[PDB]
């Protein structure tokens, strides 16, 4: 069957027998002047990408949603098992970021929609997907925000992220389900200072909570991991709820954060040499 | 009001116990959740903490009954050295201060859910201790 994606844009689903598509004028294909048919409507047998494109009476785009061995196409995005979308949150605000990867440089379009829940979905506002990085492989990223977020609640319906991927005449879609709490990765501890103690090897390590983290800290607490590590790979770790610790310095100190009450993702390390 | 720090100490212990019972990271709601309007947020706590605590109590009683049920007291039997045993006791302890096998998949669901519930409750009591 066929369906509307946007005005004058259609997705033809196919598995060579081909799918018969009736094109009603409000005929030529793409650049060519060669007339392919007469009549207000046009019957096309869509079997291949050649039988797709913008069909114009004397105006109508057709994209394909191909299916090989009974499984929709996932070529546009590369697997980061079957994980094409990776999402993170710096806090409980209802604000999150999703990233995906591709090998394609041009004629690429991404549409991103999100919601909390599937039945009577609650509004989430997403921005535009924009190229954010290149590596020796292109990285795109989007920022979404839950419309009426409730940072302190125990979520029971997941956020749903839906990404439409269109590479020329190939249409594909991607999905991701999660609770904010499961995609939490705090920013690193900030203002990581070191205070040498007179005639001793021990230093007073001090840092602050990251600026982006949920407030109040007395409610949304973090656990910090203070680490002393030398050049070559012992493990010298201490865990604390305090924003300072005292350690033995030889001749490096790192600090990382995680949510105190739920085992979410560890933050990136903040570091200072001894 | 309740023993804020004792609740703080206990609720935190529930977090670590719920973790050890299911130390798994990753990704039809027949459990009570601390929803947005149950008043367990920092503002709701100052304004009227009794409301929040009556929700924490409901949820605690609920999970006690789940942990003491056939889901956990059935084949495949729990090990004696189980955190789930400790966890059941702790839920009862905090509630008192306030006043392919199918069964395997159900334990995972309940313990994962329990982890989310106890994290909010732990935050409630930590804030309560620090500000009340």
């Amino acid at each position: 069957l066929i369906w509307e994606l946007k005005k004058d844009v259609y997705v033809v689903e196919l598995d060579a027998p081909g799918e018969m598509v009736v094109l009603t004028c409000d005929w030529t294909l793409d650049q060519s002047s060669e007339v392919l048919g007469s009549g207000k409507t046009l019957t096309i047998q869509v079997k291949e990408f050649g039988d797709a494109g913008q069909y114009t009476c004397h105006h109508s785009l057709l994209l394909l949603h191909k299916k090989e061995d009974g499984i929709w196409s996932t070529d546009i995005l590369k697997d980061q098992n079957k994980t094409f979308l990776r999402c993170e949150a710096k806090n409980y605000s209802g604000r999150f970021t999703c990233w995906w990867l591709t090998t394609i440089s041009t004629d690429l379009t991404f549409s991103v929609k999100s919601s909390r829940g599937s039945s009577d979905p609650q509004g989430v506002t997403c921005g535009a997907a924009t190229l954010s990085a290149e590596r020796v492989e292109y990285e795109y990223s989007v920022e979404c925000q839950e419309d009426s977020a409730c940072p302190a609640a125990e979520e029971s319906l997941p956020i749903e992220v839906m990404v439409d991927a269109v590479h020329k005449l190939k249409y594909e879609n991607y999905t991701s389900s999660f609770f904010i709490r499961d995609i939490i990765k705090p920013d690193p501890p900030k203002n990581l200072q070191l205070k040498p103690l007179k005639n001793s090897r021990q230093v007073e390590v001090s840092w602050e909570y990251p600026d982006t983290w949920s407030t109040p800290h007395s409610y949304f607490s973090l656990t910090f991991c203070v680490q002393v590590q030398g050049k070559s790979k012992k493990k010298d770790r201490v865990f604390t709820d305090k924003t300072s610790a005292t350690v033995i310095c030889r001749k490096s100190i790192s600090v990382r954060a995680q949510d105190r009450y739920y085992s979410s993702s560890w933050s990136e390390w903040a570091s200072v040499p001894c | 009001s309740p023993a804020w720090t004792q609740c703080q100490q206990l609720s935190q212990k529930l977090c670590t116990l719920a973790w050890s019972a299911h130390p798994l990271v990753g990704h039809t709601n027949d459990v009570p959740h601390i929803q947005c309007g149950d008043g367990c947020d920092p503002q709701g706590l100052r304004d009227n903490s009794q409301f929040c605590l009556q929700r924490i109590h409901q949820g605690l009683i609920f999970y006690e009954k789940l942990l003491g049920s056939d889901i956990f007291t059935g084949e495949p039997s729990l090990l004696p050295d189980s955190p789930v045993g400790q966890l059941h006791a702790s839920l009862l302890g905090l509630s008192q201060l306030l006043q392919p096998w199918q069964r395997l998949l159900l334990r995972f669901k309940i313990l994962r859910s329990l982890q989310a519930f106890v994290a909010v409750a732990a935050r409630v009591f930590a804030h309560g201790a620090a500000t009340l």
Binding site: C225, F239, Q258, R260, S263, W266 | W19, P23
Partner: peptide, 15 residues
């Protein structure tokens, strides 16, 4: 599945 110390609070108390 992870190590119990993966949860920093667990590690703080039992590690």
């Amino acid at each position: 599945t992870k190590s119990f110390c993966y949860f920093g609070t667990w590690c703080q108390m039992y590690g």
